[PDB]
């Protein structure tokens, strides 16, 4: 097949420029310039995916040096000639003096960037540096105090004759060299500090008591300064630190609105479509009919979503009373029919294969409902551990005595102790949709409740409102309501598959326009499995 | 409830600063009584030295006679044309025929003696490529400080995309869902990765299944970050060359030959073409595909022919 | 199993501040040591104070003029001291502060004292939180690192051990150590960090050394927000393969909070358990190990993870309760020994990690006065009153 | 006044610019061949190639003038700011050794190519005679084609990362910090 190998490669390449560049690579190999290693490395990205073509090429060509990476280039031997006196023979033979790295070569004369941090993280680093400078000065001062205290203790059992002559070298008889230099230079002036430390160096026991007293009162004032700064520092960090730990959840209030739209989900499922089609075209002609599958292991989650929905029903004011009644009834009936739930078993107190062919609005509606189900699913799957951890929150007794615990949310009852976490966040979402929660407190409680893992529930009211607005189009739009009515006609809970869904398919396809999107949402009764398979423009072509 | 009014203390105020405590409360009684800022010789920045009556400033190393800051000369300092403008050959001994006296004195070097003259009456400077050397290579250009920059280097990013690029975006797409990188604005289709035929956009409910993709800076070929071994994107520095193009320099070991390409010649008479032979040309590469620094019109048929010819020669070995 | 652990602390090492608004902060080591003393770990531990290093003892890797510059530097006369600074890149990215020479001396002394205690056999695990600088070159200071004390520790280990392995687990990986051990075969360097316009910018998959040091430099680039599970999956198999193939006689581990969830210029999402379980895994081998601390631009989490590192090296499990210390207010509102991981995106896909692992195995399958030198003597320093 | 250069030498000059400014690679003065023997070989080959109608006098004049001219222009329009430190080291060495460093003893022909490239600017900056300009440009063309005919033995592409001799050496970090810094 050596004749058609090049035409097969040309068909696989697609782009003209890439084919020409592969031609150039092959010619560079053909002119005794490129060796076997570089050719095979180039082919690894070129024809790595095609295992059959790669094996044929390797068998036909006949396959059975240093790496020299981009950094650490070789220095000349002239720079090697340097003394480095503390060197012995083995230490020569292990270390290399002709290889050096320097970051501008890595940056290619463009520099480097830092990771972008939120304003809460920036002010956390800020409060960290204010806390650094204070106690650093304080404890350098305690070290100087203990040094001069040892000096004064040596003075206290000593007489005047050698008090007059107590010449000492720099260091004050300690292993340190310049820490007292820093301390008495920081406390006093720049020019005065050098002269007073000179007097301390050559004449101790005359300036040492007074500088000890001055440094002791400096210590005491720095200590109470730290003490009354400590309270405001802690009260600021209590609300700053948890928000700083939230990175995706800080922008979740806008990212959720941006990405839970019609066109984003359309692109999301069409990408999975085109990947499946061209991957199988590479591999095998028949195509699968399952993609972007969701699992439904818990049944009470739909009841929680119903509680959120009819909590939002009685809160909004932009809709009429019979409009609200019909929308709530339809929202309940959708699970009362589609998931084969005979009736909602929570509808009393303590409550505040089959194929579906539908348009774009029902697809977006079901996608938001699956997203809210998944949010509650990762809420509930860690509930048994988070509730346990909250239940045994061992408060430090020392912090109990002098009052450093974060009681910001405990005054208003936003704390989670003594109550199941899932029911508590359900109630919190009820009051959150009700509009009397002061949102920042709600995300703060979620931050200090689930250890920042509950970042997907920040816009639970927003996704609930979007869900309600999308379900409002299920009745006002004539095509969507007609599709729903012929799903009332179609759904019969009887063995009628493989001969009744085809006429359903052509009937909806004749029912909708050319520009409307078409979706096959397959629901399975056992194990509560669902499947949405994309059939966009796959029926009107022929 | 932060209170920076009363709890901010008096001895130590807002940090990274000082206060009057180190000056007023510091009594010790224990002792018992024209110039420029651009360095117009290399167009760079650094430590500068300037002349009193000359606005030009130089570097410490950009001086014909090199000098160091540790042993800088004392008193007034003067440049070369400063020594020939306010000093000798322009104030006393006026320039009447001393230029011809250079020829008459230095043994008839007249074909170079006037250049020997204006060497000393010229400020020292770093090397600068002439403009006629620049124009024959259109792919190269002069940078901000005067460094080499061909098409291999990427244009530096503006500060809007660099500092004030919001929090969700960050320097790289390594954070949050960014589906805009998987869709090109030229046609609105999906960027299919070359190695694996998948866009891998993923889902918003499952962001972790999303695989990062990047466009190429030359052929706009999409490429996943996991297929080719690479950690993150390429935003500053050289342009991201995908591992499918011809390398500028290759290495074959027989000491060795580099073959640092043949650059690029602008479209004029120097760029000369000749297709006459397809078989056994030995043209050491540097080709272009069609349907001195000569470039022969090479086609697909000849390339695949001589490739087959060479691998039929080499398999007997 | 049970192992005697050497701790090298000085009361002066936290007294040096690089400057206002600075990421690098040696003051975290002092409150870390306060955390070990306040935890009651001194009963099953022996602690010594290492003497500061001298000029010639600091010359074992760096050149003479660089050591002389580091000894004679001072911010007061930085105005005319401008030639050398640019030569050793000091004052531009690494500002000059008081006590830089003494801080470098104590860092190097701690590193080589830990190495000498490993060599002589008085201890099995050497911990030196006073110095873990790893960005320093032969005549270049980068990453707010001036002396490459890890190279000196590896050299002192090589004076007795045939093979020494250096493991880097934090971001801003040590390029100085890899540069110093790029051509030797008796030293193998493995590092875990982020690549892609990061401050080092060095360390590739193709960066495996040249000459005799070929296939002896392991670099594992990561991405933003790597969690504990994928860090375990990228650490434990490759570390087991390194121990099976290279068979080191000593391990130099660079510990720090730079790779933690919260950091200034860091990029990872490792919790305290993820940062400590890797060290527990490499300690479970039983071979001697050397511990240094030179990473972590945050402080509150860094003290806690270093305390947990010491507790795990003492073969005990520390409680989440945090006792009162003279730095008790630095910790978070919960005031527990718990570095809470962030919720940022784990963009580190498993497929990229698997490709990196496969090519790393493909690289590694071919492996299979100096009078005071030798160190091995130090002040006892047993009278510590840091307990509160 | 216009001067042309063959495209091979222009590519060599562009490669030199990339090596210095972008790749950060300075030339190797301790090399096999320097400018003085470049012009010596040029003079000898041209003298032994053609006859003797009196052109050898102006040939030797051109060679000596180019040698001394290179001696002066080394620190005037040559030597990129990276290479100023590398000049400073060997000039200090010659100061310590009490010997005089003329550039024709260590410098290669790439700086000669730089001077030939910048020659038209200096020619246009002088009031200098027309027929002298024509004969100078003709000698420049002759030297350029002679360098073309000996281009393989003179400018061979080699990487200093793996070879001892590559007519270029890599710049160290300290050298870069001094030269391109302060
Ligand atoms: Zn770092």
Coordinates of C-alpha atoms in Angstrom, one line a residue, chain C residues 85-324:
Chain C
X85 CA 25.0 43.3 43.1
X86 CA 24.1 43.0 39.5
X87 CA 26.7 40.3 39.1
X88 CA 25.1 38.2 41.8
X89 CA 21.6 39.7 41.2
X90 CA 21.2 41.0 44.7
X91 CA 19.1 44.1 45.5
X92 CA 17.0 43.9 42.4
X93 CA 14.9 40.8 43.1
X94 CA 16.5 40.0 46.5
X95 CA 16.9 43.1 48.6
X96 CA 19.8 43.5 51.0
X97 CA 19.0 43.5 54.7
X98 CA 20.8 43.5 58.0
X99 CA 22.2 40.2 59.1
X100 CA 22.2 38.6 55.6
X101 CA 25.7 37.1 56.2
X102 CA 24.7 35.7 59.6
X103 CA 21.4 34.3 58.3
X104 CA 23.3 32.6 55.4
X105 CA 25.8 31.3 58.0
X106 CA 23.2 29.8 60.3
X107 CA 21.3 28.3 57.4
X108 CA 24.4 26.6 56.0
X109 CA 25.5 25.5 59.4
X110 CA 22.1 23.9 60.1
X111 CA 22.2 22.1 56.7
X112 CA 25.7 20.7 57.0
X113 CA 25.1 19.8 60.7
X114 CA 22.0 17.8 59.7
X115 CA 24.1 16.2 57.0
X116 CA 26.9 15.3 59.4
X117 CA 24.4 13.9 61.9
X118 CA 23.0 11.7 59.1
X119 CA 26.6 10.6 58.1
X120 CA 27.9 9.9 61.6
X121 CA 24.9 7.8 62.7
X122 CA 23.7 9.6 65.8
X123 CA 20.3 10.2 64.2
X124 CA 18.1 8.7 61.5
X125 CA 16.1 11.8 60.4
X126 CA 17.6 15.3 60.3
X127 CA 15.4 18.4 60.4
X128 CA 16.7 21.9 59.8
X129 CA 13.9 24.4 59.5
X130 CA 16.4 27.2 60.0
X131 CA 17.6 27.0 56.3
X132 CA 16.1 25.4 53.2
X133 CA 17.3 27.8 50.5
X134 CA 17.4 26.2 47.1
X135 CA 17.2 28.9 44.4
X136 CA 20.8 30.1 44.9
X137 CA 23.3 29.5 42.1
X138 CA 27.1 29.5 42.2
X139 CA 27.3 33.3 41.8
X140 CA 23.6 34.3 41.6
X141 CA 20.9 35.0 44.2
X142 CA 17.3 34.3 43.1
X143 CA 14.0 33.6 44.8
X144 CA 15.1 35.6 47.9
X145 CA 17.7 32.8 48.3
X146 CA 21.4 33.7 48.7
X147 CA 23.3 30.6 49.9
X148 CA 22.5 27.2 48.4
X149 CA 22.9 25.3 51.6
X150 CA 21.2 22.1 50.2
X151 CA 24.2 21.6 47.9
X152 CA 26.5 21.8 50.9
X153 CA 24.4 19.3 52.8
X154 CA 24.4 16.9 49.8
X155 CA 28.2 17.4 49.6
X156 CA 28.6 16.5 53.3
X157 CA 26.4 13.5 52.8
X158 CA 28.5 12.4 49.8
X159 CA 31.6 12.6 52.0
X160 CA 30.1 9.4 53.6
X161 CA 27.2 8.2 51.5
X162 CA 27.7 7.0 47.9
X163 CA 24.3 8.2 46.5
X164 CA 22.2 11.2 47.7
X165 CA 18.7 12.0 46.4
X166 CA 17.1 15.5 46.7
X167 CA 13.3 15.7 46.6
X168 CA 11.5 19.1 46.1
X169 CA 7.8 19.1 46.7
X170 CA 7.0 22.9 46.7
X171 CA 6.4 25.4 43.9
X172 CA 9.4 27.6 42.8
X173 CA 11.6 24.5 42.5
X174 CA 15.3 24.5 43.3
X175 CA 17.2 25.2 40.1
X176 CA 20.5 25.8 41.9
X177 CA 20.7 22.3 43.2
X178 CA 19.8 20.8 39.8
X179 CA 22.4 23.0 38.2
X180 CA 25.0 21.9 40.7
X181 CA 24.2 18.3 40.2
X182 CA 23.4 18.2 36.5
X183 CA 26.4 16.2 35.2
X184 CA 27.2 13.9 38.2
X185 CA 25.9 10.4 38.4
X186 CA 26.1 9.9 42.2
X187 CA 23.5 12.6 42.8
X188 CA 19.9 12.3 41.6
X189 CA 17.5 15.3 41.8
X190 CA 13.7 14.8 41.7
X191 CA 11.4 17.8 41.9
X192 CA 7.6 18.5 41.9
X193 CA 6.5 22.0 40.9
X194 CA 4.5 24.0 38.3
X195 CA 5.8 24.9 34.9
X196 CA 4.4 27.5 32.5
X197 CA 5.6 31.1 33.0
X198 CA 6.6 30.5 36.6
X199 CA 9.4 32.3 38.3
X200 CA 12.1 29.6 37.9
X201 CA 11.1 28.7 34.4
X202 CA 13.5 25.7 34.5
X203 CA 13.0 22.0 34.7
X204 CA 11.6 20.1 31.7
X205 CA 10.8 16.5 30.9
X206 CA 13.8 16.6 28.5
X207 CA 15.9 18.1 31.3
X208 CA 17.5 14.9 32.5
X209 CA 21.1 16.0 32.6
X210 CA 24.1 15.7 30.3
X211 CA 27.3 13.7 30.4
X212 CA 27.5 11.3 33.3
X213 CA 24.4 13.0 34.9
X214 CA 22.2 11.8 32.0
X215 CA 18.8 10.5 33.2
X216 CA 19.6 11.8 36.7
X217 CA 17.4 14.9 36.9
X218 CA 13.7 14.3 37.3
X219 CA 11.3 17.2 36.8
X220 CA 7.5 16.7 37.3
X221 CA 5.7 19.9 36.2
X222 CA 2.2 20.4 37.5
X223 CA -0.6 22.9 37.0
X224 CA -2.8 25.2 39.1
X225 CA -4.9 23.7 42.0
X226 CA -3.6 20.2 42.2
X227 CA -5.4 18.4 45.1
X228 CA -4.2 15.8 47.5
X229 CA -5.3 12.7 45.6
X230 CA -3.7 13.5 42.3
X231 CA -0.6 14.7 44.2
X232 CA -0.5 11.3 45.9
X233 CA -0.9 9.6 42.5
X234 CA 2.0 11.6 41.0
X235 CA 4.2 11.2 44.1
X236 CA 4.0 7.7 45.5
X237 CA 4.5 5.6 42.3
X238 CA 7.4 7.7 41.0
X239 CA 9.0 7.8 44.5
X240 CA 8.7 4.1 44.8
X241 CA 10.3 3.7 41.3
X242 CA 13.1 6.1 42.3
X243 CA 13.8 4.0 45.4
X244 CA 13.7 0.8 43.4
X245 CA 16.0 2.0 40.6
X246 CA 18.3 4.7 42.0
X247 CA 18.6 3.2 45.5
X248 CA 19.8 6.3 47.4
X249 CA 21.7 6.2 50.6
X250 CA 20.3 9.5 51.9
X251 CA 17.3 11.7 51.1
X252 CA 17.2 15.5 51.2
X253 CA 13.6 16.6 51.3
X254 CA 12.6 20.3 50.9
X255 CA 9.6 20.9 53.0
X256 CA 7.5 24.1 52.9
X257 CA 4.1 25.7 52.6
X258 CA 4.7 27.1 49.1
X259 CA 2.7 24.3 47.6
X260 CA -0.1 24.6 50.1
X261 CA -3.6 25.8 49.2
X262 CA -2.9 29.4 50.3
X263 CA 0.2 31.1 49.1
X264 CA 1.3 34.5 47.8
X265 CA 3.0 33.4 44.5
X266 CA 2.1 29.7 44.8
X267 CA -0.3 27.9 42.6
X268 CA -1.1 24.5 44.2
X269 CA -4.1 23.3 46.3
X270 CA -2.4 20.9 48.7
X271 CA -3.9 20.5 52.1
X272 CA -1.8 19.8 55.2
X273 CA -2.6 16.0 55.0
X274 CA -1.6 15.9 51.4
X275 CA 1.7 17.8 52.1
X276 CA 2.4 15.5 55.1
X277 CA 1.4 12.1 53.7
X278 CA 4.1 12.3 51.0
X279 CA 6.7 12.8 53.6
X280 CA 5.2 9.9 55.6
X281 CA 5.4 7.7 52.5
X282 CA 9.1 8.6 51.9
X283 CA 9.8 8.1 55.6
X284 CA 8.2 4.6 55.6
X285 CA 11.2 3.4 53.5
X286 CA 13.4 3.6 56.6
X287 CA 16.5 5.0 54.9
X288 CA 18.0 8.2 56.5
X289 CA 16.5 11.4 55.4
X290 CA 17.3 15.1 55.7
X291 CA 14.6 17.8 56.1
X292 CA 15.0 21.5 55.3
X293 CA 12.5 24.3 55.3
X294 CA 12.9 27.1 52.8
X295 CA 9.4 27.4 51.2
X296 CA 6.1 29.0 52.2
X297 CA 5.2 32.7 51.6
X298 CA 2.2 32.3 53.9
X299 CA 3.0 31.9 57.5
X300 CA -0.1 30.8 59.5
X301 CA -0.4 27.6 57.5
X302 CA 3.3 27.1 57.2
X303 CA 3.9 26.9 61.0
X304 CA 1.1 24.3 61.3
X305 CA 2.4 22.1 58.4
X306 CA 5.9 22.2 59.7
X307 CA 4.6 21.2 63.2
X308 CA 2.7 18.3 61.6
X309 CA 5.9 17.4 59.6
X310 CA 7.8 17.2 62.9
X311 CA 5.0 15.2 64.6
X312 CA 4.9 12.7 61.8
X313 CA 8.6 12.4 61.8
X314 CA 8.3 11.7 65.6
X315 CA 6.0 8.7 64.7
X316 CA 3.1 10.3 66.5
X317 CA -0.3 11.6 65.4
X318 CA -0.9 15.2 66.5
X319 CA -4.3 16.2 67.8
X320 CA -6.3 18.9 66.0
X321 CA -6.4 21.0 69.1
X322 CA -4.0 23.9 69.2
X323 CA -2.4 24.8 72.6
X324 CA -1.7 28.4 73.6

